[PDB]
Ligand binder design. Structure first.
Ligand SMILES: Cc1ncc(CO)c(CO)c1O
Lengths: 148, 153
């Protein structure tokens, strides 16, 4: 088991944790996760995951310029994108109840609601409170206790 | 246009095509492939592949800063990394017989032997003679027959 694999599984676990604080307006029977753009640590997600409640999380890769990310995805896990691609993605998510989490995120000021920092002894993440507030999903504030 | 999983599967086949033109000085029983950095089209590779002669390609992701990439990997599928990360990677491969292929076309300028262009109707690729020469492996020039046909409607 490589360190990328260990981390990938941790990313899976961190994500499940975050998911538990999120509520969608209409809760789907199967939670759709979309991995968008190049990622290092999404392989665990892509094998599939199940929430504590029993809801299955189905994950697949979708393209940065898929115009239907907002209706096809309940959760976005965002990899390497440039500014024009990131804007494209979030224009698709606009007005839809979509949880967004980015794999990197030096700053986490614009774009995703939560930004993982995966390198390092443990995975940490930051919260973008403004993204959270414009996101369409409800987020229990206790999740911030799990952030950095 | 094409789907992501379609492209990934096609990436597998282009890579197998490229492998077929390459020879390692001491041919291993199992070809070791390392996916390094963030990738969008490597999920197929990571299932493992088999070459026409029946040799298996074992694939796994490895860290950019793994100093033993050159020793642990026969092939590098290079993802989308930064300047410093890339330099680390190729410094690690120096003096080791390693085939390097990049997911994006930008990397032929900076160390990768082959560089894929995945968007479009077919997957095309370009190559760099400098990086090939210093690679420690032999590449038959016929490899560009595959690139040319891929680039042809
Ligand atoms: C594409 C290409 N790759 C490799 C070589 C020699 O390794 C040649 C011939 O020098 C070539 O044309």
């Amino acid at each position: 088991r490589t360190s990328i694999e260990q981390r990938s599984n941790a990313v899976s676990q961190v994500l499940l944790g975050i998911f538990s604080y999120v509520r969608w307006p209409k809760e789907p029977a199967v939670l759709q996760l979309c991995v968008v753009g190049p990622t290092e640590y999404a392989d665990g997600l892509l094998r599939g995951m199940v929430q504590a409640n029993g809801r299955r999380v189905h994950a697949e890769r979708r393209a940065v310029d898929n115009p239907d990310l907002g209706t096809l995805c309940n959760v976005i896990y965002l990899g390497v994108v440039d500014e024009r691609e990131r804007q494209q993605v979030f224009r698709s998510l606009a007005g839809h109840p979509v949880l967004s989490i980015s794999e990197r995120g030096t700053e986490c000021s614009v774009g995703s609601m939560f930004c993982l920092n995966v390198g390092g002894p443990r995975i940490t993440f930051e919260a973008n409170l403004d993204s959270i507030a414009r996101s369409g999903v409800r987020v229990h504030p206790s999740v911030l206790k799990l952030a950095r």
